[PDB]
Design an enzyme around this catalytic site. Structure first.
Site, PDB file in Angstrom:
ATOM      1  N   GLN A  73     -16.781  22.347 -31.931  1.00  0.00           N
ATOM      2  CA  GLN A  73     -15.663  22.435 -30.911  1.00  0.00           C
ATOM      3  C   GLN A  73     -14.316  22.741 -31.089  1.00  0.00           C
ATOM      4  O   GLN A  73     -14.225  22.917 -32.259  1.00  0.00           O
ATOM      5  CB  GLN A  73     -15.382  20.239 -30.321  1.00  0.00           C
ATOM      6  CG  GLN A  73     -17.029  20.303 -30.300  1.00  0.00           C
ATOM      7  CD  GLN A  73     -16.506  19.064 -28.680  1.00  0.00           C
ATOM      8  OE1 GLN A  73     -16.211  19.318 -27.920  1.00  0.00           O
ATOM      9  NE2 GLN A  73     -17.828  18.097 -28.548  1.00  0.00           N
ATOM     10  N   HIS A  74     -13.642  22.366 -30.215  1.00  0.00           N
ATOM     11  CA  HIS A  74     -11.816  22.193 -30.109  1.00  0.00           C
ATOM     12  C   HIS A  74     -11.281  23.527 -30.392  1.00  0.00           C
ATOM     13  O   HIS A  74     -10.208  24.561 -30.495  1.00  0.00           O
ATOM     14  CB  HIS A  74     -11.249  21.609 -30.654  1.00  0.00           C
ATOM     15  CG  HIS A  74     -12.203  19.987 -30.178  1.00  0.00           C
ATOM     16  ND1 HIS A  74     -12.510  19.340 -30.981  1.00  0.00           N
ATOM     17  CD2 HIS A  74     -12.210  19.748 -28.961  1.00  0.00           C
ATOM     18  CE1 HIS A  74     -13.313  18.075 -30.312  1.00  0.00           C
ATOM     19  NE2 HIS A  74     -12.978  18.830 -29.087  1.00  0.00           N
ATOM     20  N   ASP A 273     -20.594  21.043 -30.494  1.00  0.00           N
ATOM     21  CA  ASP A 273     -21.369  20.631 -30.752  1.00  0.00           C
ATOM     22  C   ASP A 273     -22.539  19.144 -29.831  1.00  0.00           C
ATOM     23  O   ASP A 273     -24.075  18.997 -30.312  1.00  0.00           O
ATOM     24  CB  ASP A 273     -21.538  20.398 -32.107  1.00  0.00           C
ATOM     25  CG  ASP A 273     -20.192  20.005 -32.582  1.00  0.00           C
ATOM     26  OD1 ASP A 273     -19.462  19.661 -31.717  1.00  0.00           O
ATOM     27  OD2 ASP A 273     -19.742  20.022 -33.582  1.00  0.00           O
TER      28      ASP A 273
END
Ligand SMILES: [Mg+2]
Length: 506
Positions: A73-74, A273
């Site tokens: 992520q991110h 994820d």
């Protein structure tokens, strides 16, 4: 090729995995994997190379009909006008952007309290972030990375033509896009994403399906001035947020996948994820998973949006059109390491000790905020043993307090998520902590329910394949794949353990 195959890709911090799988059954057909360089920042070129090597090891994708990428992520991927990556991607575990996360909170909290808002500007800023996009800023989040780049690398921030996440970028490359020459079309608008990864940017609001381009302008201002920052944030290409079972407008490039199947290889929306693993685990609304490594992650699927005004629980979206309240704990298995050092024992020794005790550890309670906690939101907190007595201050009871503390924190997370309006009616326990006999044994008792232990497997890659099979099938519900369960832990509830813990932690 009579047999219909999909591929689930899992591009994580550490590696790329490719799981060629049976669309109808979820059965593994081929598999391949390659390593990423270490580091909390990285050149996405390595993610492309790892994907290629992983896919080759998995025997290619020429016979694959749909593909989805689950991603860490991110991670901030910024592209210029020509589709070039501008500077290294800054990942979920980069802490460079910590000052920017702090500043974002102060910046939104600055305006005076309104009817009901907290008087403290920090509490108020946290609450405004949660209401705006679901989560209170931490260094992990994409917006904080963009902020950091504006503050530290102004020449780079001004070149931004598109911002996207790791799963988004890999999908775009799989579609055959990438850097072009000057004056060529980069097709940045071909970028797509899903609700789960977009919800991790803190410039997207899942409830309304809106990008908050004003929050982007807010961080660009440092480098560009207010109106220029406003213009930039409007001009930036952001990935089209696809529904949970929509095919992307573009298919895989035939050199990469689908050249030997009818219609080539479609691309499913992909995802972050945590949500992809949840899909792979077959989780639906009411399920929570506890991933217990050295640190913990409690993720539940919620029918409705969730808002922890405290800023502990993240308000992400899942991969089924719903919601993923996500509670990170700094202290998971590491609590048990603390226990070993403290008592001078190894794992089994600790367990034997703890089982020699009684539920409640004869009055000793550990609030295990070693080095603070994410959930509850207490950064400068420290761990605390309480209820100690001459009679009860013994290795057995301490041992038991270490274990009961670990489990009680995870329960605390379940109760907090419940308090956000999300029912939790079944618990899955995964990660390394799941093989711990003591955790495994005491979980049902203190968590207050049966604890299911899914067999260890590539949940992210499986979830991505399930989503690709879902899109390919065109049916309303996701593929009903068989799930393997290692076991179910049952144990009479002992509420007084957690009730004591709650008192102690305050
Ligand atoms: Mg687009």
């Amino acid at each position: 090729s009579l047999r219909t195959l999909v591929a689930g890709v899992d591009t994580s911090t550490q590696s790329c995995k490719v799981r060629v799988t049976d669309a109808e059954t979820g059965e593994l057909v081929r598999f391949g994997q390659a390593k990423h360089p270490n580091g909390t920042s990285v050149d996405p070129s390595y993610w492309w190379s790892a994907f290629q090597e992983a896919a080759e090891q998995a025997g290619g994708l020429d016979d694959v009909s749909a593909l989805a990428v689950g991603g860490q992520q991110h991670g901030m991927v910024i592209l210029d006008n020509q589709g070039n990556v501008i500077r290294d991607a800054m990942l979920w575990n980069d802490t460079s952007s910590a000052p920017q996360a702090a500043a974002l909170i102060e910046k939104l909290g600055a305006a005076p309290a309104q009817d009901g808002e907290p008087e403290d500007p920090i509490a108020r800023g946290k609450q405004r972030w949660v209401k705006a996009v679901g989560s209170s800023p931490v260094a992990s989040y994409t917006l904080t990375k963009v902020a950091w780049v504006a503050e530290n690398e102004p020449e780079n921030v001004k070149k931004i033509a598109a911002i996207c996440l790791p799963h988004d970028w890999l999908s775009w490359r799989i579609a055959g896009y990438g850097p072009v020459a000057e004056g060529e079309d980069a097709h940045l608008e071909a970028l797509f994403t899903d609700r789960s990864d977009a919800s991790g940017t803190i410039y997207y609001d899942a409830a309304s399906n809106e990008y908050r381009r004003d929050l982007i302008a807010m961080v660009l201002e440092a480098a560009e001035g207010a109106k220029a920052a406003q213009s930039h944030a409007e001009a930036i290409v952001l990935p089209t947020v696809l529904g949970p079972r929509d095919a992307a407008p573009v298919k895989a490039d035939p050199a990469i996948a689908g050249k030997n199947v009818e219609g080539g290889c479609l691309l499913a929306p992909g995802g972050g994820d945590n949500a992809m693993a949840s899909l792979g685990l077959g989780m639906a609304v009411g399920d929570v998973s506890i991933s217990l490594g050295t640190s913990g992650v409690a993720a539940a699927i919620s029918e409705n949006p969730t808002y922890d005004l405290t800023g502990a629980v993240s308000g992400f979206a899942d991969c089924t059109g719903h919601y993923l309240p996500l509670a990170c704990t700094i202290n998971g298995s590491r609590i048990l390491d603390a226990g070993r050092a403290a008592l001078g024992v190894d794992y089994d020794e600790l367990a034997k000790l703890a089982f020699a005790s009684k539920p409640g550890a004869n009055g000793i309670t550990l609030v295990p905020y070693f080095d603070g906690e994410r959930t509850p939101n207490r950064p400068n907190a420290t761990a605390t043993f309480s209820g100690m007595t001459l009679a009860n201050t013994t290795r057995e009871n301490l041992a038991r307090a270490f274990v009961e503390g670990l489990l009680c924190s995870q329960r605390d997370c379940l109760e907090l998520i419940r308090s956000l309006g999300a029912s939790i009616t079944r618990i899955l326990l995964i990660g390394g902590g799941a093989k711990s006999e003591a955790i495994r044994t005491l979980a049902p008792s203190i968590l207050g329910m049966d604890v299911t232990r899914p067999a260890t497997d590539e949940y992210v890659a499986i979830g991505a394949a399930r989503q690709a099979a879902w899109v390919l099938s065109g049916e309303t519900e996701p593929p009903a794949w068989q799930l393997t369960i290692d076991g179910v832990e049952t144990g009479e509830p002992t509420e007084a353990v957690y009730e004591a813990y709650a008192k102690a932690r305050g």
